[PDB]
């Protein structure tokens, strides 16, 4: 590590406009057990290949090297300053089916991923460079933002139902109980057993249910080979809008309801990233870290118009993996003894994951048990989110209204999700804003809560 | 008129009946009009299982229709009874429930699958409420378990309106929830001519302004109104009971069991929910002692589940409350006497008039084509309150962190999963939680979750 931080003090790095940026050993150190992590966790990153496959069309090798682009994509906030470890919107996964089951899977549904991710990453430019994405953070209600957190989480519940188990039972309660039973003071203090899990995070979930999956027949054993992964771009190609063509005007409109949508599940993952964030910037004295919101609004547009042109991406490009950024927050708080800054713990764990990539013998163990882990990351985005959203609840009366807007953002049709958006205001404008169903006073409430 | 009247701080006059107390409308206690009103026009839910029992039992409409007979006069058990909990289905379990009834051909063997289903929901009920356990595990069963299972069932409910087959629902739902959070306030009808007059109508104004939405936009046919008498036609009714049809073997009662199970789970909750509701409001109305026996609860759910076993194989069970009307009965209750005389008034007479209203042929012709938007509302109705009433009752953050792995196992659609979880939940336990290898969890060093 050639450049150290001062107590107290932002880490190291190079002043890059709006962006920061860091590289591993120059302005972070490289943190074993996120190294560990990130070579064996990267299944996820790989557990795409099965929606490539079915909604777009696409050959096994062609979806294969679009996790290389994703891979590549994964490194760029603890590149570009961003404290968030990134993944898809994972809660907004079902909703993007449903967009693409109307196209055959093939160039036309690559067509319509385009017009869906190109805006996506529009709408988080825009929100980002006039930096009306803060803005948001700041005036929107609490009430609100705990609704879409809560709505988000149980999106990401609708979604292992329409996606496609002991494998996913045991994988979910292991993987769960360890990220509970690691947000707690000094756990690792406590016990021999809770010091060695936490240098695994999510390892220990992922592989027993895979373990499980293996012996009990659910999926078969893999044909495991030697040797560096070798992708095939030019296989690749053919599934890139470089190949097949652009899609109509009219296609962007269809993609306008599910666009916004995925937006705001994605600002629920941002309230959740930075919720975790917020917390462990207080425990720990010793690290200055900025939560740049716009920023991240950025660096994940230029996520998604790169997958929009390179790799197309049936879960997009969201802000934050929750379980993965949870785990490396959690091993943060635990100490500089631990972990040295939020970037050397987020940055490595990618990066490690990039690498891994290139383990063939890896790619094809994990390449039998793949859904695994798809439905893993949706069962436990859905957890957290829930967990938070509650948490993040006031009153009564916030209680109230977010059960509301929970319910509707977990009804999967997108126009749906507007026409309630709508109908809200028509009727908060003609009946709640002249208070003609009184004031909501959370000690007043009788029968909901006290 | 009233014979019996109430003396202040007692509880409801009624005849004692063993493990039941009696009470009869005009003789117990006081007709209420407005829940006579609500249940003229509200029993359309009762009627909303119809295309359940036409599309997964395959009966006709009429046949379906007569099943609704005999679910309105098990809706009148409760009051008739001794239960303030009003009554209806255990509706976030329908889900799974159709999923069990989607292995069967709908017709005869979906019917003989829904009596073993439904005969052993009964026993279930029956057992733990004669052995006063259904008592016990109100309370030995921790809260983390108890919000957990409430979260879930209210999850479950929206998995449901998915899978059960819109403007319409979406005004009908945001209007009806709307109406039920505002309502839930001290002396919001003292503020407001609005309120007021909104408080007296209770779940209508969202019911019938979803319906007219509803026909004016075109998803739904408008109706052929009927003038007369509805007559229940009991004699095609009995085609379509385990009378004339089969009774199925022991091999069907045994894949029955695990979604047996988890709809009694589930109703537990919905128990839980109402006690809640009931418990508060009592505390509010001093001038009435109400008597909370969750083993009463379960004797008259056990009668009216193996009432429907063997007369109206139901395929949303006979559950301990429909969730939004007990919510809309309590609240009107919650506002004082000079509205509701008590608890029994306002749920006794809801029923009541629904039962009667099923008579109202011109009522029934009416809603007939837009039942879809009954069934759908009670599922994210149910969905709201229970998300709602769960989330509140949880006091830290340690018993949020288990309410979550709970809420999200219960919330998946296959019910042996659900087991699988408890078991796997349990062996976890053993090893690992007891030993208290991973430290203790106190809510006050929880940093990454809470604070
Ligand atoms: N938002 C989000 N994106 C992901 N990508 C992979 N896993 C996840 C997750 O849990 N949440
Ligand atoms: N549990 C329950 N059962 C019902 N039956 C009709 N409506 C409802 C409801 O909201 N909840």
């Not at 941002?270 to 690290?287: A, M, Q």
Request: proline share 7%; net charge neutral.
């Amino acid at each position: 590590q050639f450049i150290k931080r001062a107590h107290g003090e932002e880490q190291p790095y190079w002043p890059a406009g709006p962006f920061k940026i860091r590289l591993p050993f120059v302005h972070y150190r490289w943190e074993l057990p996120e190294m560990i992590q990130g070579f064996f966790m990267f299944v996820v990153g790989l557990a795409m290949i099965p929606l490539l496959e079915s909604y777009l069309g696409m050959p096994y090798e062609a979806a294969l090297a679009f996790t290389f682009v994703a891979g590549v994509g994964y490194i760029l906030p603890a590149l570009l300053g961003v404290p968030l470890v990134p993944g898809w919107i994972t809660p907004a996964i079902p909703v993007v089916l449903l967009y693409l089951k109307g196209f055959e899977p093939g160039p036309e549904a690559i067509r319509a991923l385009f017009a869906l991710q190109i805006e996506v990453a529009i709408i988080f430019l825009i929100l980002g460079a006039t930096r009306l994405g803060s803005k948001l953070v700041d005036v929107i209600p609490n009430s609100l933002k705990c609704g879409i957190i809560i709505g988000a989480g149980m999106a990401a519940m609708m979604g292992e139902l329409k996606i496609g188990p002991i494998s996913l039972i045991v994988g979910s309660i292991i993987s769960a109980y360890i990220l509970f039973s690691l947000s707690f003071k000094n756990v690792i203090n406590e016990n021999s057993f809770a010091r060695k899990i936490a240098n695994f995070g999510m390892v220990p979930g992922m592989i027993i249910a895979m373990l499980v999956g293996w012996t009990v027949g659910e999926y078969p054993l893999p044909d495991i080979k030697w040797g560096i992964t070798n992708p095939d771009f030019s296989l690749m190609w053919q599934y890139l809008p470089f190949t097949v063509g652009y899609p109509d005007w009219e296609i962007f409109l269809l993609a306008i309801p599910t666009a916004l949508i995925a937006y705001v599940i994605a600002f629920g993952d941002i309230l959740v990233g930075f919720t975790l964030v917020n917390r462990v910037d207080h425990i720990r004295k010793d690290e200055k870290i900025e939560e740049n919101v716009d920023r991240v609004h950025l660096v994940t547009a230029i996520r998604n118009g790169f997958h929009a042109f390179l790799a197309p991406w049936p879960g997009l490009a969201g802000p934050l993996w929750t379980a993965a950024h949870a785990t490396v927050a959690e091993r943060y708080a635990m100490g500089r003894k631990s972990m040295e800054s939020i970037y050397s713990g987020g940055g490595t764990f990618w990066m490690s994951g990039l690498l891994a990539l290139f383990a063939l013998p890896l790619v094809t163990l994990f390449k039998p048990v793949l859904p695994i882990a798809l439905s893993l990351t949706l069962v436990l985005t859905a957890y957290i989110c829930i967990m938070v959203g509650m948490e993040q609840l006031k009153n009564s009366t916030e209680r109230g209204v977010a059960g509301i807007v929970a319910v509707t953002l977990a009804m999967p049709d997108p126009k749906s999700t507007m026409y309630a958006v709508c109908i809200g205001v028509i009727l908060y404008f003609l009946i709640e804003r002249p208070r003609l169903m009184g004031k909501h006073n959370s000690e007043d409430n009788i029968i909901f809560a006290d």
